[PDB]
Amino acid sequence: PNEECLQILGNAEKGAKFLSDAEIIQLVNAKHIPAYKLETLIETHERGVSIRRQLLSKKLSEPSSLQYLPYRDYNYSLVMGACCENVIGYMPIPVGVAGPLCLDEKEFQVPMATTEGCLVASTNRGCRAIGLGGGASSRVLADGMTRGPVVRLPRACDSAEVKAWLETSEGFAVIKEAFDSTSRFARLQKLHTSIAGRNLYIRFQSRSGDAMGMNMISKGTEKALSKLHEYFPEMQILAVSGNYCTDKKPAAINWIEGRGKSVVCEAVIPAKVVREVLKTTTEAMIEVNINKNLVGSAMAGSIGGYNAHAANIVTAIYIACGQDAAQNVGSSNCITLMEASGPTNEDLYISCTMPSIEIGTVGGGTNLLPQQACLQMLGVQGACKDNPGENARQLARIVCGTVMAGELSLMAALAAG
Amino acid sequence: GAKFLSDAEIIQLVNAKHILIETHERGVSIRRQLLSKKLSEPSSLQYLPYRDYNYSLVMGACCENVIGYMPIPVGVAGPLCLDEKEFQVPMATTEGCLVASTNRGCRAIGLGGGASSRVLADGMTRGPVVRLPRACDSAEVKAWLETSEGFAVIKEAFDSTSRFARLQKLHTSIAGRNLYIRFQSRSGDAMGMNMISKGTEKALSKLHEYFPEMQILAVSGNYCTDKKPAAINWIEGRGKSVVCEAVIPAKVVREVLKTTTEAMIEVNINKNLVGSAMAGSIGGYNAHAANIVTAIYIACGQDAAQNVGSSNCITLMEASGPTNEDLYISCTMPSIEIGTVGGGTNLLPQQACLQMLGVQGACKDNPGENARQLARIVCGTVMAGELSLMAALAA
Amino acid sequence: EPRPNEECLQILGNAEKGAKFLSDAEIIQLVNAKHIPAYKLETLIETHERGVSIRRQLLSKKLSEPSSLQYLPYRDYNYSLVMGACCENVIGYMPIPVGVAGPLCLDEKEFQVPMATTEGCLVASTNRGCRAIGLGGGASSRVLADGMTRGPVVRLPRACDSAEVKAWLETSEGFAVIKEAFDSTSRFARLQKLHTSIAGRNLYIRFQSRSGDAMGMNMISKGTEKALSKLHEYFPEMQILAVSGNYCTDKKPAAINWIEGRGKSVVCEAVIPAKVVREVLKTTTEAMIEVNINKNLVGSAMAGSIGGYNAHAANIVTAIYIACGQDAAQNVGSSNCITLMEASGPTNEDLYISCTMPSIEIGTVGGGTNLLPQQACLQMLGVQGACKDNPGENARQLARIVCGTVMAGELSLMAALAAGHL
Amino acid sequence: EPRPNEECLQILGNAEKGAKFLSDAEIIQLVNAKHIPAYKLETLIETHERGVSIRRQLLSKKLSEPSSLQYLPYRDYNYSLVMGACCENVIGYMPIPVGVAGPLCLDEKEFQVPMATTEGCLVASTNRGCRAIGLGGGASSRVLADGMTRGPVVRLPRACDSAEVKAWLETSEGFAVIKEAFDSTSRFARLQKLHTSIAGRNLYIRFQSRSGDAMGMNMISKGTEKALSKLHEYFPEMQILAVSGNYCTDKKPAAINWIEGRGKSVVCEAVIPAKVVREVLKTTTEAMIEVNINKNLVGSAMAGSIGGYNAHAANIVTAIYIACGQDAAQNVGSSNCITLMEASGPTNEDLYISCTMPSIEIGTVGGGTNLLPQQACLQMLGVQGACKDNPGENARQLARIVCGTVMAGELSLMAALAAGH
């Protein structure tokens, strides 16, 4: 009944919990109730998902499309008004595990969410060679998420004035105070700027504790630019990101300046281990690395893509561990080097250098519990109380270390043919 | 067999190195318990779900040492009015507001009479590196591959390996005695990596016959280029090269997008062109194409690591209409790497999202048309994403 | 002494008098107060040199230090081949010292390579590279590709229309019509496969063709214009926005030139005996390879280079280009080079070296190669002017010489850096 | 009259005679008989021009056409400033025509810009661009950054050690010890913040400093060599692999030069009224923006350019570089330019134009600027040699003049592309 059902919705202590599935759907189709009124009216999250699927399904060319998209018994409360909207369900990505990865005297079992055949198996083989080689070592070389707004002044002489002002000790200090006032972990490092006529691109860089820090840095960037407006009232803020960050697009600035964590990792693989585990020789590995990862990438016109498949490992760890998998674009930046080592140049020195690993252990997908499980496997879930940023640094080191395992195994598979 | 043993006992054997199980879901349980013994926090696994998932479609083709699955929330943006049709576009993401913003982009496009798209090129690639004794020899091979007779014999060998192996023009570059060879072929509705690899191996094997001193150094010399940033994918395309466009009436930019045509053009020029230029970008002349590509790719069983190149996009915005107040927007994405059969599209949840869009599996009438359609959907939804985010930045 | 402007104009407009019957003071007087603007001085003054002399006197009064031009030479230079062709508002010439590096043993021949440069030691260093190559049996090179390009941008009303034009150009019959219009413009105009790129309703079209021994810019542009006119017959709503849309790409760095080639794409190589690397180059093979990998490959990669995987190819390209009447601004793309070094031979102690240069933009007819001094340098190499019995051979040979001299230069400088002064 | 070889040698080794007492034919007879190496002619022959003359006679006999050097001039040129400084094995000089575009109205001054080129209409076209700027009220420019660089590669035993070295150079005291070493080598050496990059056990170190009015390669390199010697005292396992590891980056295309700058980073701007755009440039502001956006931004984007967002900056950079005694091979990076074009005024009919050139590598002291003809062109612009009272001002002014003349070039070519035919 259409007019009885409205009575049960309007009563403040009854609610739509008393109504049925088809009755709420009869209301919308008759146009008694608009569609957008169902988000706010319906009580529980899972029933909101159910009714959206049903409404959505009748509009589809094949109304049975959603049959095998699962949606029941998922914690939508951590996702609603925080991570996803118009939610009709969830997508299971198989999670495999590669390890142990022997990195800086610890051992890691690395979760990898992927649907590419053999990626975990191959990565795990690279892990095996590293462990039988005495483990890999890594260092975090730099740390600071960025945002890169574009501002505009009337003339290029003015934009130049502002650049010189931001380069002074006094002007930087003023901007630093306004940026840092927005948050606990927001500490502004040296500003990088570029002029293009009357445009001025300003790359704000700051650590962000254990968060990846896109939201924190943005908040700092806006207050900092508000303070900059007080010194330069004619300055227009065109966009809070003018693509100079650069976020989720290939850019040499991230390659050269770094973004998020800049990391290096390295290991030596005995000749014996290269033969028995990797089914090739040190000399063959080197020849392939030089001519694939340097020369080949060079011929193809690569900026920052001097590696075999860093992106595969970055992406799978990112999906498993609640990262922004779109940031695989810049986070997969990697140069993989290989050279002969040891008494008779028969052992394999390998290193991966990844200048822009954009990563966090708090916020975003890491609020969700399956994603926290994977972060917990690695011992890096959430914030680190004693050493703010140490969980995010550790995960970045794991990523780089795991990328190196991936590089060893794939580069060996290609070398053996 | 194993059904009479217990979980605690079978692990006893694998630990002792004296060592399959009769049910897929139990194989996952026992793997979780083996892994569990190696972690400092074994209870970390308890909220990583694993039950009642169809592991049969995974075991052999997709993933090894599987211990569960990672649920990614799926949202829907649409209807996206694209080429006289309506699509409800699934987007798997954990990024706040990404679906809502994309959906707004869709709303603006529909009220502007919808978007139009064309597939400009189509062919996955693979770019092996080979070596000859001398640069004079590598050059002889290049010359030979550029003749009609040479290309035809390399084509016959490539094409013999499978149904959809149909070799297009070759692209080669020499680096001294190295020769990089870029094979491009369509691949039915599959993304086509395995297919083009098999075609490449038999083609390189046939090239070895003409040049026995040639060394096949690696079936991928990074000249493809797969999953790394490369100008070659931007200039030559890879997979589907696609263009999409729409005109958004002035009032619609005002009321829906909360800005103006003029302000939008000013941000696009100075962010997506000039800004990306100052940043030293090749192919990243867009706001956030990667957000949409990645979200759709995870939802639709694509290889999410191919967002590196699939996200390549130039977003252009011009003034339009008689009064010059309407917003012409286009997105050009020359390297969308995509398929509707194989990989993660073999799993039922991922197929649900492909079925939403009406592109699931092979198009039996016209091989490749579902993958082509999906690329067009990706490019149209990227343009929707560009519209909304650029409006939010300009406002 | 100078008589009034009125009388000076009557003598100027008389056929049997002209400018020969006036003073320097009097020509300068007419210019200072219009009647003669300044650029018309070339087509009015008795001789080329007096036109240059007068232009200098005009300029000198405008300067802060009037005697600035004292040591800028101008007398007795053959300005006839310059005027209307190479340069306007000419006040003189700039002497660039020319040294010789050689013999360069390339493809079983010997070359004495002229290099116009002011950088100390460049010719000496390059010359040592030639010697190391000579003692190692010499270099070999092949020309891989040959075609100068021009990359106009056109526009259709919509992206779907530009898509239609791309597909039409990709059909055999569409390209054959465009090729016919292109090729009708000159005897050397032969259009190769078209490269096309869409950016919304924009459509960049890369026209490529050999061009005899000319570098070919003017010829290609002419071919391009007739090709687009014909294209407009089929697609009347097409607008030519610019005859170059930076898609060629000329005189700017661009991945397309690196990947597709432009002008002449060349490869060169040589094996240097271990003995020679030690004695001549003061280093070892092992050391050279380590420096090359970690400087020219890894270092160039960390700096974010496209096409710059070399030590100083640009030094050599520029010196040969100025010496040989080339367009030195084309150093931008023509310097593209990847230098590779590896172990070779029985001992694995000999140095294999190769230099691959995909975009050497060059020619032996036209532009600066019309002037006799730069023809002298071209004649040194045996590549001056057009080749009658094999059109394009001289420009191809010059491209090979450039790539081989670059390799010579790479060998030497890389050995200097590898030794570290020692 | 030509004497036997043994007789000619005693004359050559007689200290109160020498080669001055031999004829050309005798000196050649000695070279051909392998008594004198051909390269030692420079230090044996008393006059520089005679050394050039004999090198030419020797060279001509090696050529397939012996008269090929006829129209290569060599006489009455001042080889004294070139020998052992600018060029070796010298057989003459190459005259490049010099034209003048101007006046360039820049920062309330006027410049007559010399351009050594052989490309037809380049000077005339650039000169049209100058007219538009001057009738548009002039151009204004700013040097934004100043510092030549050198980017050596060193190697440590492990990547962990390269990381240790990077962190050490990033502390204020580690940097200060390196800065003290670097600054000690020359009066203008002032080491700026160190930019470093790791690749495994490689460490690339980008040393940047002002260099007076010199372009500064040799100076920066000398400071770099001494700075690395100091760093070796703290890290004795460090290997200096190469004083240039291509991270500078000198004379190759590189994003690092685009993003960080190198030498002089400059920006230039003008507003061109519609009337001037009409009469001088023969077009409209609307047409020029449409061409600039779709050629210099979008076109360069599709071509995969880094730093090549301009029409023909390189033409102007190269022409001025040759005239003014610069290193013309550095036009690779010095030509880096993004040209921007906007509508201004009430009906979008005035043309705001700017050129941004982040890496103008230039000098007015040293190299080819030591030669008198090259100094004449520097003197034309008022930038010859070192500025005593304001060190670096001449080099800074020249880089502004390049950027401003580049903008002039951009205006004219783009206008011509916007019209047709």
Ligand SMILES: CC(C)n1c(CC[C@@H](O)C[C@@H](O)CC(=O)O)c(-c2ccc(F)cc2)c(-c2ccccc2)c1C(=O)Nc1ccc(S(N)(=O)=O)cc1
């Ligand atoms: C990592 C994955 C699994 N993988 C890929 C696909 C990698 C792509 O996703 C990225 C590349 O396209 C990037 C690039 O190189 O340009 C390939 C492969 C790459 C390019 C080809 F043309 C063909 C095959 C190979 C491979 C297999 C054989 C011989 C050569 C290469 C493997 C590979 O690593 N398998 C493996 C190893 C050990 C074990 S084991 N025995 O340890 O379990 C199993 C499988």
Ligand SMILES: CC(C)n1c(CC[C@@H](O)C[C@@H](O)CC(=O)O)c(-c2ccc(F)cc2)c(-c2ccccc2)c1C(=O)Nc1ccc(S(N)(=O)=O)cc1
């Ligand atoms: C699309 C996403 C959700 N989004 C992002 C994050 C996008 C990043 O993941 C990619 C960028 O970093 C790439 C780049 O531009 O460099 C931002 C944003 C971007 C850069 C900042 F510095 C700060 C915030 C914005 C935004 C919000 C406000 C004002 C300006 C920008 C939005 C955005 O589109 N929200 C939105 C719009 C409508 C509705 S509605 N009214 O339809 O529901 C909801 C949310």
Ligand SMILES: CC(C)n1c(CC[C@@H](O)C[C@@H](O)CC(=O)O)c(-c2ccc(F)cc2)c(-c2ccccc2)c1C(=O)Nc1ccc(S(N)(=O)=O)cc1
């Ligand atoms: C070719 C030129 C002359 N040349 C240059 C300057 C080359 C620049 O124009 C381009 C580089 O900057 C490009 C780069 O590497 O990034 C340098 C040099 C390069 C970078 C430095 F940091 C310092 C010095 C060297 C050099 C000398 C010694 C030790 C290391 C390098 C030489 C060089 O080749 N001299 C030489 C050799 C043999 C004979 S001989 N004995 O054969 O006549 C003479 C001179």
Ligand SMILES: CC(C)n1c(CC[C@@H](O)C[C@@H](O)CC(=O)O)c(-c2ccc(F)cc2)c(-c2ccccc2)c1C(=O)Nc1ccc(S(N)(=O)=O)cc1
């Ligand atoms: C500057 C030079 C002289 N110039 C060039 C050649 C410039 C090349 O050296 C570099 C370009 O290739 C870079 C690029 O755009 O990709 C061209 C030209 C460019 C691309 C073509 F396909 C064809 C012709 C043009 C031109 C002529 C006509 C119509 C359009 C463009 C001119 C040009 O500026 N002439 C002129 C102007 C005023 C006066 S006046 N009347 O003031 O004296 C004379 C001549």
